[PDB]
Write an enzyme that holds these catalytic residues in place. Structure first.
Site, PDB file in Angstrom:
ATOM      1  N   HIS A   1       0.802  -1.219   0.000  1.00 11.43           N
ATOM      2  CA  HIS A   1       0.000   0.000   0.000  1.00 11.43           C
ATOM      3  C   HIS A   1       0.833   1.267   0.000  1.00 11.43           C
ATOM      4  O   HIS A   1       0.277   2.348  -0.190  1.00 11.43           O
ATOM      5  CB  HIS A   1      -0.926   0.068   1.217  1.00 11.43           C
ATOM      6  CG  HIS A   1      -1.893  -1.063   1.325  1.00 11.43           C
ATOM      7  ND1 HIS A   1      -3.145  -1.027   0.755  1.00 11.43           N
ATOM      8  CD2 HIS A   1      -1.802  -2.252   1.961  1.00 11.43           C
ATOM      9  CE1 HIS A   1      -3.780  -2.151   1.026  1.00 11.43           C
ATOM     10  NE2 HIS A   1      -2.986  -2.913   1.753  1.00 11.43           N
TER      11      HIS A   1
HETATM   12 ZN   LIG Z   1      -3.511  -5.995   4.374  1.00 10.79          ZN
END
Ligand SMILES: [Zn+2]
Ligand SMILES: [K+]
Ligand SMILES: [Zn+2]
Ligand SMILES: [Zn+2]
Ligand SMILES: [Zn+2]
Ligand SMILES: [Zn+2]
Lengths: 183, 385, 576, 353
Positions: free
Chosen positions: B150
């Site tokens: 992320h």
């Molecule tokens: Zn995750």
């Protein structure tokens, strides 16, 4: 209590901006192609070409220069939404690093001029001006509005920045968002 | 196109033999995200513990990757971001109240300690793995410490800071033409999908949850722009999926990709937050329903990397990764846990299994047919390699 | 029409209007002769794609992505990211492992630093006084990780004093090493003993919550069987199938849909089980008296015997043989007078329509019924469905429990909850199904408090046998419904005609029409009529709804049979 | 060392009797590692070296919260960007910071005679701008703030209403769930997503009948002794035709950001792609709008802002029928003519050969 009756299409354009610098998070691309000075110089040039009375053109040029200087001095104070202030600061930094003191009139587009006009009634009625002077100001800015609405599709066209180019607006990165809004 | 097929048990492929490599640093287990945080570097220790009590050290070679330096990390991020990471500490946080809001590192992913060191270890592991593959001493590299997918280019969002999967894929791309990134964490791997959205040399395929759930990205219509049109496969699933439905969706999509994309190196992100019982995830998978996918990817026999990922409950994820490593080494592991230092967490049954709950399955077959139909129809155009 | 919208885009926007009408839409298609497309990514202008990005070579420029960006606040509409539920016991299981992490984290950091401190002491012992005079310890203590030992020191040494001792350590090693080493050892000892002595209680607690916190569709189930089993829902499901069948009948390409409800009844012992359960329930129940007890047993017994045509004496032998391992016509019980007496004793078209259709050796049979008979039969088939689901998981669960390899390393330390083996509730490797039945008997009797039943069904059936948590409150339901068939005289007489019809061995359509009309005579135009149509060869039970003007039987397939039913319907002057 | 941790007590302390009462009923092989790990530095880049007036908690310019500088001479405080020029927090003003208004007052020394004097002075200097003079004098005396549209223009449209913080909200936003978070922590597991409970969501409340699915025409309700045949009917917010989450292939309950719109609402933008722009006005609601009936109903084109009846230009169904027939037949004619010119050029180039 003075009232300024903007044509409906320009009210729609203003609300369209008011959404664009709100929940879509875009900003005005700068330096735009048609600043304030080009707009007003074109307006005054076109209107002096038709007008024959001397005092008419005197009050014309006075209105032009006055609107110019007052936009110049007020832009920083009360024409910018919250999200835009960061771009403003960055422009100041760049100007002071390049040693050119900043002029708002030669960078900012016409949409800020419409913002100014839309404000103008409160600006005047907060003062002690003459009734005839404020009245002539209203008539004058009204004629400016008319001339602007004749050419409204030369400046305020839509281009969807996310696909081709050179739209009147651009998008902001998440860092710019973070700093400007959530400083 | 989806057709209900029951759960066939996982078994070792006889012929596919390969000389693997296990990366582990003896220190990463000390870090710890301050107080109550769903992801923590204790579960990186427990895994290794089991691999050292089951005695897999005789089956493969374990290294420790020399850490990444600032220049090497800055192949992806901007100088300012990497530097601010390398400088920040909880004592002088107040000095950084402009950057700590620009870069998002103060709120959801706090700054704790060894931050730069932890991130550097994960990054160096990932890169050295891609390199040893690249050079070719091995044919697999497991790195259960890396896998922070992320972390975007200039902001650390989602408890992960340095986005080492991108560095690994770049070092892979130095020699191999086309690389395929298969993501099976429940969230959407927006970091990698973004950072290869405008290219055709890396194809990202993510099976994630859609709905009002982090990070709200990963619709079916995000399918890559520029030269990379039709080179990204997002699959939005719905809640409560079980092992059978997950396998029945996974297998055809991966076979179709590897029929048409023909990658030369696979990078499989083997996250553990898709498991039953996580604090964050909402799926209902077992251990077998999660090892089945890695077994399937290995079956084809491509130089691949397996990377770690999420993990919110150290018991499930620890046992899952021990099982996945055992499976990768052509050994089915005995379902009874030996004696190790952390024997106390695995109660009450003290077994190597993970148990699914009776949560209600929502993935209606017609939905799956429409999704796989759209995806096949798009992929019809990747036929040219 | 004003050349504003594309052709294919128009085609797509019309498909959502004529999609189910394929002929009209293909007529329209042949008649007419037939960038951010992803809603999540923006585009940044090529004035922000220029940042330092120190170490990028040529390849990392052509392959990476800088302009096209997207982030989880323009996708979330500035407000989103809802979270899961995480029922209470699950966060009570979270807190335990949180405490575990705290303890183990501190212990392991203490160990990792104390070992390096000890080897530095090993380095400094064999040196000389002059060398210890000039010895300095570099930051890192000669190790690779620089910040963990400062963390443990500042935790133990009052962080200001922590800085004091850490600098006095790096600069004065020979005087500070042994004292801090000894204190670290002492703190490790105290922490470790406290850790294990608390580790006892942690396990003691998580054992009483684990399975109860992994199986919770079963607690949205103490209420989704007391509220989703009323007659409202029961008629709503089938009326919905009916209405949808009707409104899709207008879709003429769709064939005539099947009857509303279908049922299969493969396993027969479960009826014996249900009768034993009801008997035990009423035997315990003190709201009825002994004659009513016997009436209840008799009704259940004989209705199950007839409707399923099961031989009564075989039922009796199987039931008494059941009662071994634990240590009269239907009308005769139907009418109170009969029951009490027996208990105290101890043109050519019409004629051809009526001549054809008398089925010989009846094999397909009917029941007509108003609502309460549906509800009785519904409770019956529901309870059968649940018990069958279990007796199908039976074999696999037995093979599972037989191979549960207890790790004696734990049981010597009593690491496993002997609670359910202390009372002996656990399922021996014998038939788990029989154990479930006997346990339900005990619950109805009350010999075991409810929580023990629930935990036994959780652990023995690891997650899949939760529906039986209500096995008591359902039977009490069923039995109570049975009582209505005795008291509401109307339902008793409808059931009377049922006895007559199902007892009839040969009948045509005409006598069936007579049955329908005589039953609809008992209930007015306000009540509904549904056929529970029985098939004994296949043992299939098909329930159909009836709009009050609909036919007795499902619509025929041929036109001749349709004319036959029409003429036999006009033969009785009742409104067709 | 006596300071409590997550466990409830000091770390060097066993459990209390209350916890152990309410929580009760009554060689290894990773010794190794420093022997098997051997470092890897096989990577390609190893060459790289690597008076006490209390101030406010609000930005009185934007009335939202943040990290703000406070005033030494008035209680008003601003974010660091809300000034003209905006001030960098790294280089703070050395000493007391005085706002525009207090700096103004101390510049005028609380003497209005000097005010009128300098006003006359200013209007004397720039007679060039004799009209705007008052405002040009006063601009430097008012404290900054963000720009709010004057309400007399927010009223021209009814479907334009401000959010919480002065933001555009054009009624396509669902609502402020607020108390729904307390609802989100529901005592009984019946959370917003509506999982494992769809008995009475398939049935209209006021009427009482079933919610049909426009694309498959079945309210699939299943049976709550057999729930694996439900199909999650949801209803639009504009037209309310109830749809299946499997016909409009999306798989989520749009519940937080906006209201969901069926595929049965026509455009609200164009993107001609050959790439022109909008075909729809805003809602020029109230009395002010002028509806105009045409005098000609066959080839009047005028806009795409039509209004259908039995400057917004009304029209009848049969008229648009005719206009679409016109489009269709002119299109078939021009297509036929294109094929004709194609074939005739083909025949010319053939006969040339
Ligand atoms: Zn995750
Ligand atoms: K791509
Ligand atoms: Zn502000
Ligand atoms: Zn002030
Ligand atoms: Zn549907
Ligand atoms: Zn709609």
């Amino acid at each position: 209590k003075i009232s300024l009756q903007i044509p409906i299409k320009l009210k729609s354009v203003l609300v369209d901006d008011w959404e664009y610098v709100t929940k879509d998070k875009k900003i005005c691309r700068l330096p735009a192609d048609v600043t304030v000075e080009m707009v007003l110089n074109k307006y005054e040039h076109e209107v002096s070409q038709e007008l024959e009375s001397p005092g008419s053109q005197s009050q014309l040029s006075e209105y032009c220069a006055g609107l110019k200087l007052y936009f110049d001095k007020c832009l920083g104070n009360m024409l910018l939404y919250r999200l835009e202030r960061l771009q403003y600061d960055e422009l100041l930094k760049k100007s002071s690093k390049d040693q050119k003191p900043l002029v708002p009139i030669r960078i900012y587009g016409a949409i800020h001029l419409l913002r100014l006009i839309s404000v103008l009634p409160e600006l005047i009625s907060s003062t002690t001006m003459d009734l005839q002077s404020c009245q002539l100001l209203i008539k004058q800015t009204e004629d400016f509005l008319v001339w602007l609405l004749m050419h409204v599709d030369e400046y305020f066209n839509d281009k969807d920045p996310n696909r081709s180019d050179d739209a009147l607006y651009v998008n902001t990165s998440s860092q710019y968002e973070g700093v400007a809004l959530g400083m | 196109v989806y057709e209900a097929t029951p759960f066939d048990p996982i078994t070792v492929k006889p012929s596919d033999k390969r000389r693997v490599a296990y990366f582990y640093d003896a220190d990463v287990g000390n870090y710890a995200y301050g107080a109550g945080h769903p992801m923590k570097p204790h579960r990186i220790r427990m895994a290794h513990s089991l691999i050292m009590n089951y005695g897999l050290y005789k089956k493969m070679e374990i290294y420790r990757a020399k850490p990444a330096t600032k220049q090497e990390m800055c192949q992806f991020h901007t100088d300012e971001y990497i530097d601010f990471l390398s400088r920040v500490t909880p004592d002088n946080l107040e000095m950084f109240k402009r950057e700590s809001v620009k870069f998002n590192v103060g709120d959801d992913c706090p700054v704790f300690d060894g931050l730069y060191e932890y991130c550097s270890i994960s990054g160096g592991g990932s890169m050295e793995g891609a390199a040893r593959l690249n050079r070719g001493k091995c044919d697999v590299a497991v790195n259960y410490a890396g896998g922070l997918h992320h972390a975007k280019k200039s902001e650390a969002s989602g408890f992960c800071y340095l986005n080492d999967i991108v560095l690994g894929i770049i070092e892979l791309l130095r020699y191999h033409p086309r690389v395929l990134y298969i993501d099976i964490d429940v969230h959407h791997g927006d970091g990698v999908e973004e950072a290869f959205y405008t290219t055709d040399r890396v194809m990202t395929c993510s099976f994630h949850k859609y709905g009002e759930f982090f990070p709200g990205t990963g619709e079916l219509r995000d399918i890559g722009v520029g030269a990379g049109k039709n080179y990204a496969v997002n699959v939005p699933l719905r809640d409560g999926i079980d092992d059978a439905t997950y396998r029945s969706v996974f297998e055809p999509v991966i076979k179709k990709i590897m029929e048409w994309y023909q990658p030369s190196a696979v990078v499989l992100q083997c996250g553990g937050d898709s498991l039953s019982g996580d604090r964050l995830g909402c799926f209902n998978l077992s251990m077998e329903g999660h090892a089945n996918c890695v077994n399937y990817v290995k079956s084809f026999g491509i130089p691949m990397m397996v990377v770690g990922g999420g993990g919110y409950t150290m018991r499930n994820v620890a046992r899952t990764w021990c099982f996945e490593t055992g499976l990768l080494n052509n050994v089915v592991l005995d379902k009874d846990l030996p004696y190790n230092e952390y024997y106390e967490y695995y109660g009450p049954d003290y077994k190597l299994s993970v148990r699914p709950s009776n949560m209600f399955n929502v993935n209606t077959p017609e939905y799956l047919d429409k999704v796989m139909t759209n995806i096949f129809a798009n992929l019809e155009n990747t036929k040219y390699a | 029409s004003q050349d504003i919208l594309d052709l294919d885009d128009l085609v797509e926007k019309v498909d959502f209007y004529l999609g189910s009408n394929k002929e009209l839409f293909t007529w329209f298609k042949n008649f007419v002769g037939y960038e951010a497309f992803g809603p999540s990514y923006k585009r940044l202008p090529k004035s922000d794609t220029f940042m330092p990005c120190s170490g990028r070579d040529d390849m990392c420029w052509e392959v990476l992505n800088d302009e096209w960006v997207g982030h989880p606040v323009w996708a979330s509409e500035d407000s989103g990211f809802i979270a899961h539920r995480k029922n209470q016991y699950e966060e009570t299981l979270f807190k335990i492992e949180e405490e575990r992490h705290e303890y183990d984290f501190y212990i392991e950091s203490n160990l990792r630093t104390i070992q390096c401190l000890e080897t530095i002491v090993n380095k400094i012992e064999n040196m000389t006084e002059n060398e210890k005079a000039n010895f300095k310890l570099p930051p890192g203590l000669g190790h690779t990780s620089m910040t963990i030992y400062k963390k443990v020191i500042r935790k133990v040494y009052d962080k200001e004093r922590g800085f004091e001792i850490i600098d006095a350590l790096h600069e004065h090693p020979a005087v500070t090493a042994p004292v801090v080493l000894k204190r670290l050892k002492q703190k490790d000892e105290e922490w470790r003993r406290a850790q294990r002595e608390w580790n006892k209680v942690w396990r003691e607690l998580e054992q009483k919550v684990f399975f109860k916190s992994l199986d919770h569709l079963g607690l949205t189930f103490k209420q989704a069987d007391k509220k989703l089993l009323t007659t409202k829902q029961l008629i709503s499901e089938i009326s919905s199938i009916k209405v949808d069948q009707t409104n899709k009948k207008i879709h003429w390409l769709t064939p005539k849909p099947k009857s509303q409800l279908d049922f299969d009844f493969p396993d027969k012992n479960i009826f014996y089980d249900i009768l034993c359960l009801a008997d035990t329930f009423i035997t315990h129940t003190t709201a009825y008296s002994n004659p009513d007890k016997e009436r209840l047993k008799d009704l259940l017994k004989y209705f199950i015997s007839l409707f399923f045509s099961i031989s009564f004496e075989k039922i009796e032998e199987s039931l008494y043989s059941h009662k071994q391992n634990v240590s009269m016509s239907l009308l005769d019980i139907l009418h109170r007078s009969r029951y009490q007496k027996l208990k105290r004793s101890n043109g050519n078209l019409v004629e051809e329509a009526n001549s054809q259709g008398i089925i010989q050796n009846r094999s397909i049979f009917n029941l007509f019924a108003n609502t309460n008979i549906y509800i009785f039969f519904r409770h019956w088939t529901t309870i059968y469905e649940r018990l069958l689901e279990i007796k199908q998981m039976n074999e696999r669960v037995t093979k599972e429990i037989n191979t549960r390899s207890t790790v004696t390393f734990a049981k010597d330390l009593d690491l496993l909850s002997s609670q359910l083996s202390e009372m002996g509730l656990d399922f021996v490797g014998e038939d788990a199904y029989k154990q479930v039945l006997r346990l339900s008997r005990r619950l109805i009797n009350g010999d075991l408090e409810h929580q023990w039943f629930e935990e036994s069904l959780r652990q023995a059936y690891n997650n899949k046998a939760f529906k039986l948590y209500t096995i008591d409150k359902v039977t009490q339901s069923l039995v109570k419904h049975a009582h209505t068939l005795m008291t509401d005289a109307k339902t008793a007489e409808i059931m009377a005609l049922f006895v007559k019809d199902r007892n009839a061995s040969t009948t045509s359509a005409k006598d069936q029409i007579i049955y329908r009309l005589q039953v609809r005579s008992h209930m007015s135009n306000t009540e509904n009529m549904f056929r529970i149509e029985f098939d004994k060869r296949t043992l299939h039970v098909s329930i159909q709804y009836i709009a009050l003007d609909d036919l007795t039987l499902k619509e025929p397939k041929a036109d001749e049979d349709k004319w036959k039913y029409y003429v036999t319907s006009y033969a009785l002057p009742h409104p067709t | 060392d006596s300071k409590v941790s997550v466990t409830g007590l000091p770390l060097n302390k066993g459990p209390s009797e209350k916890i152990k009462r309410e929580s009760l009923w009554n060689d290894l092989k990773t010794f190794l590692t420093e022997n098997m790990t051997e470092e890897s530095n096989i990577r390609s880049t190893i060459g790289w070296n690597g008076i006490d007036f209390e101030n406010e908690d609000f930005c009185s310019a934007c009335n939202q919260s943040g990290s703000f500088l406070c005033c030494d001479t008035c209680p008003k405080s601003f974010h660091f960007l809300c000034l003209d020029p905006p001030i960098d927090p790294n280089n703070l003003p050395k000493g007391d910071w005085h706002c525009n208004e207090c700096k103004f007052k101390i510049f005028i020394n609380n003497s209005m005679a000097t005010l009128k004097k300098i006003e006359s002075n200013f209007i004397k200097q720039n007679n060039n701008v004799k009209i705007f003079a008052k405002l040009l004098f006063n601009i430097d005396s008012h404290n900054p703030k963000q720009f709010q549209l004057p309400n007399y223009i927010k009223e021209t449209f009814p479907a334009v209403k401000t959010g919480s913080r002065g933001q555009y909200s054009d009624e396509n936003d669902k609502i402020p769930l607020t108390d729904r978070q307390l609802f989100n922590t529901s005592y009984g597991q019946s959370i917003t997503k509506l999982d494992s409970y769809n008995p009475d969501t398939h049935i209209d409340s006021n009427s009482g009948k079933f919610l049909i699915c426009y694309k498959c025409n079945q309210t699939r309700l299943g049976s709550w002794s057999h729930p694996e045949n439900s199909r999650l009917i949801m209803t639009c917010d504009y037209c309310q035709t109830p749809w299946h989450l499997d016909c409009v292939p999306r798989a989520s309950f749009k519940n937080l950001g906006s209201k969901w719109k069926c595929p049965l609402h026509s455009p609200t933008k164009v993107y001609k792609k050959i790439y022109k722009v909008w075909k729809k006005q805003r809602l020029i609601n109230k009395k002010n709008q002028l509806y105009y009936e045409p005098l000609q109903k066959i080839g009047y084109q005028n806009n795409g802002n039509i209004q259908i009846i039995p400057k917004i230009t009304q029209i009848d169904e049969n008229s648009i029928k005719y206009d679409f027939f016109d489009k269709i037949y002119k299109s078939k004619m021009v297509q036929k003519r294109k094929l004709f010119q194609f074939q005739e050029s083909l025949i010319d180039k053939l006969v040339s050969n």
